[PDB]
Amino acid sequence: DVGGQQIFSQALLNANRRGEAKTALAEVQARHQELLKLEKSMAELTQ
């Protein structure tokens, strides 16, 4: 035969992407602790 075959295609993500808890967005934990510290200090200052 000839020109008797078509083809589909699939896709893989990036390795650098890896997980979802990869800091800069997941380290919002540590940052939240910073923000809570900020909030406590501001509460005192406003008082």
Binding site: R31, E34, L38, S41, E44, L45
Partner: peptide, 19 residues
Amino acid sequence: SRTAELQAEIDDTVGIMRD
């Protein structure tokens, strides 16, 4: 770094206000 600077300024302003 920006948040730490802000925290430092707030602590200092608390200090000025404590005076």
